[PDB]
Amino acid sequence: HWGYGKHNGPEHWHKDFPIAKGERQSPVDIDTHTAKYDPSLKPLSVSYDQATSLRILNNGHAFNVEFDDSQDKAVLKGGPLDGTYRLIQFHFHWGSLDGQGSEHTVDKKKYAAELHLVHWNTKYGDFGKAVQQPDGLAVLGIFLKVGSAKPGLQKVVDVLDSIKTKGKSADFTNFDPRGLLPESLDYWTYPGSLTTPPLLECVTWIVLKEPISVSSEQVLKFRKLNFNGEGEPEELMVDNWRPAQPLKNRQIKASFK
Ligand SMILES: NS(=O)(=O)c1ccc(NC(=O)Cc2cccs2)c(F)c1
Ligand SMILES: [Zn+2]
Secondary structure, three states, X not given: OOOOOOOOOOOOHHHOOHHHHOOOOOOOEEXXXXXXXXXXXXXXXXXXXXXXXXXXXXXXXXXXXXXXXXXXXXXXXXXXXOOOEEEEEEEEEEOOOOOOOOXXXXXXXXXXXXXXXXXXXXXXXXXXXXXXXXXXXXXXXXXXXXOOOOHHHHHHHHHHHHHXXXXXXXXXXXXXXXXXXXXXXOEEEEEEOOOOOOOOOOEEEEEEOOOEEEOHHXXXXXOOOEOOOOOOOOOEOOOOOOOOOOOOOOOOEEOOO
């Protein structure tokens, strides 16, 4: 099955998932000088005050913090979006080294990691239906660089020892994702895809200009996770990112001048 190794990595995905070579694949390089300011873009509306986190899961590709998405408790609206998108989970992609790890790049620059807050369009009723629609998902992407610690991330870091291997989950209630956001909500936006199989072309990407900083100790703890299940040969969960894909017939829009 698919993964991030030499024999099952991003270069191989197209064989099982031909959409990997499609017209609106993610991630992409964000060329800051070619992106166009769109003064008609509304400010992002992030309403996470009633968020209800439930669980944290190691799924063998990353770890997801999952939320109760059975009502409008934590939603994203505005920006390039029409309607309401409900937060279902967030996860990260990261590197084996601080110099790589993000999926999107900015003028070819790689960050140490990238946070994805995944939301689905409520007009489609549930996540499974949404991923089958061109405007089904909105993913808010946030770059991580290594520097000072991110206090709001620490609760996540501290539970990782309990979900070291594939298939492990742990209760994770009362986590506030507002603690993972940078100060500015300035963003770039473009139409794209899931960055892992099945690579469905259902995502409006909203990538924040301002990275958050996390400590070297924090990202080191990400790199102690395992891709494998318990009792299988240990393979560290690192470099779980897809490289930048061709932009093709798309324009990246900026919310800021
Ligand atoms: N890295 S990402 O583009 O933000 C992403 C990548 C994958 C999923 N989820 C799934 O792929 C789960 C699905 C299985 C079958 C259809 S969707 C997701 F919800 C978000
Ligand atoms: Zn992701």
